[PDB]
A paper describes a structure:
In the present work, we identified deoxycytidine kinase (dCK) as the target responsible for the sensitisation of various cancer cell lines to gemcitabine, using reverse-proteomics. dCK is a key enzyme in the nucleoside salvage pathway and recycles bases and nucleosides originating from the degradation of RNA and DNA to achieve the biosynthesis of deoxyribonucleotides, which are required for DNA replication and repair. This cytosolic nucleoside kinase catalyses the 5′-phosphorylation of 2′-deoxycytosine (2′dC), 2′-deoxyadenosine (2′dA) and 2′-deoxyguanosine (2′dG). dCK is also responsible for the initial phosphorylation of numerous anticancer and antiviral nucleoside analogues. dCK adds the first phosphoryl group to nucleosides analogues and is usually the rate-limiting enzyme of the overall process of converting nucleosides to their deoxynucleoside triphosphate form. Hence, dCK is clinically important because of its relationship to both drug resistance and sensitivity. Previous work has revealed that dCK can adopt several distinct conformations, which are a function of the nature of the nucleoside and nucleotide bound.
The designation ‘open’ or ‘closed’ relates to the compactness of the nucleoside binding site. The hypothesis for the functionality of the ‘open’ conformation is that such conformation assists in the initial nucleoside binding and the release of the monophosphate product. Moreover, it should be noted that masitinib and imatinib were able to open dCK in situ, since we were able to obtain these 3D structures in the ‘open’ conformation by soaking the protein kinase inhibitors in a ‘closed’ dCK crystal. The binding of these compounds also released the monophosphorylated substrate (2′-deoxycytidine-5′-monophosphate), observed in the ‘closed’ dCK crystal and still present in the other nucleoside binding site subunit, elucidating at the same time its mechanism of action.
Residue numbers in the entry:
A (entry chain B): 20 to 64, 78 to 260
B (entry chain A): 20 to 67, 77 to 260
The structure:
Amino acid sequence: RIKKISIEGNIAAGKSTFVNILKQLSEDWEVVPEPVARWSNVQSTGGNVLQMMYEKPERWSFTFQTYACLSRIRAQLASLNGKLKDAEKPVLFFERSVYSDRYIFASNLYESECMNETEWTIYQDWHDWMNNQFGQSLELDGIIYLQATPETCLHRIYLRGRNEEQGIPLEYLEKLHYKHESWLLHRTLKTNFDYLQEVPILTLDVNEDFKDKYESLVEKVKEFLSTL
Amino acid sequence: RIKKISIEGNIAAGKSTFVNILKQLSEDWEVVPEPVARWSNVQSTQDENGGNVLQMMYEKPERWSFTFQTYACLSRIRAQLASLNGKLKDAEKPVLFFERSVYSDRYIFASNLYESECMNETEWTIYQDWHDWMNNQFGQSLELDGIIYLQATPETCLHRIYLRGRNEEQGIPLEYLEKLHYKHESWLLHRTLKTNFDYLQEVPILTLDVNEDFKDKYESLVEKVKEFLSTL
Ligand SMILES: O=c1ccn([C@@H]2O[C@H](COP(=O)(O)OP(=O)(O)O)[C@@H](O)[C@H]2O)c(=O)[nH]1
Ligand SMILES: O=c1ccn([C@@H]2O[C@H](COP(=O)(O)OP(=O)(O)O)[C@@H](O)[C@H]2O)c(=O)[nH]1
Ligand SMILES: O=c1ccn([C@H]2C[C@H](O)[C@@H](COP(=O)(O)O)O2)c(=O)[nH]1
Ligand SMILES: O=c1ccn([C@H]2C[C@H](O)[C@@H](COP(=O)(O)O)O2)c(=O)[nH]1
Ligand SMILES: [Mg+2]
Ligand SMILES: [Mg+2]
């Protein structure tokens, strides 16, 4: 019975950065980071299935997207049962969606011919099902679109220095950025999950370095939150 | 209220052949076959010609062992779960026969493919958690009440595989069948296969020797089933 909100955007736009700005001096706010740490070592509930994916996508992209998405829905679900339901005015923020996996990233790869048509049918059969009983409660109350041009994104992918993702072309980020605008701005993107069409969208321009200029966005979120 | 019973055995032992003799036998009896149909042609799940993932897994197992086993298990979990909600729930002595359980998927077919090196370490690591957590979530509904093992020599299975005519599996070596036979015997007969799900060790099994052609001489066996069920 908490306000579940997704912090969405591109590769190193600054999601995890703002997620940690929000984790701070907000007792009624706790964040759920995408398991990009647990995708790096694949062990018992290591091996790098993200690097394997980035390396031979026309091979591991499917195995990966499946593990990636499962790890999300596992962590997301588990967070609420525990944590702090008792607090009076709670908000739980999710680094990425279960939807962004299927509709922006896994779709992207399929189109980029990394996912065999039959790999795509399976992924979808799987996803449309995982989010029925497990992603039942786990439904969204709002999405925060951290907008950043693919241009800055690329500099900030290096600025990070994550080696698996250093061989990323602007053209890739560019093709992602378009799936984003199509989903969260223009809203031309059509999903199987029909409630998602109506839910709110706070667009924030994170092109301008917000590391020590966070105080404005946080006001604009506190606003967006009063709404829901 | 619904008794759940697994019909287990090696490839082409006579699971469906046996399960259809019992489906006819009573009104309070119903079967849940394995979705080999949706594996042969992978479709978009529509209600009011897709690839063959089983053929893919066969011709190049290095590549489709994991992909198939995941789909295979999902489709099973999906199908089974569906049967319980069906209209036959209100009856006196209603049983359910399942063509293979979610345990044979992992502990026989998936594990062997990992032993045969077709599926890599991290491919295996992923499978297991997935199968664990997924199965554990909403687990109570699917617990078996008993298992029926249809015992046939790997050579009988090779004959029945040929008797069937499944193009894709017409290349299955004796050794493959021989390997799977050992994993069934280990689990369902010698009862030495340790599985994560602990309830299993306490479920009653009924082993039958389908080495002789039962399409005709089924009378003896059924009566055994009937009495095995009276003791559940
Ligand atoms: O105001 C900011 C926010 C982020 N970053 C850089 O952006 C990356 C962090 O982005 P993050 O991983 O948080 O975003 P996500 O990957 O979740 O999109 C790193 O390179 C940071 O140094 C930056 O330089 N200034
Ligand atoms: O006593 C028997 C049992 C089976 N079969 C044939 O053997 C093949 C494999 O049987 P089935 O599909 O039932 O085996 P399963 O794969 O279900 O264990 C089929 O063509 C059956 O008609 C047969 O001729 N006689
Ligand atoms: O559905 C997803 C989600 C994430 N990623 C990868 C992209 C990034 O390299 C890595 C971490 O995400 P960012 O925080 O860098 O966006 O996750 C995918 O490939 N597919
Ligand atoms: O978990 C499974 C289940 C089935 N099969 C294969 C073996 C058979 O060729 C076919 C199913 O038919 P029978 O098991 O009914 O023979 O799928 C597997 O490899 N793994
Ligand atoms: Mg990240
Ligand atoms: Mg069969």
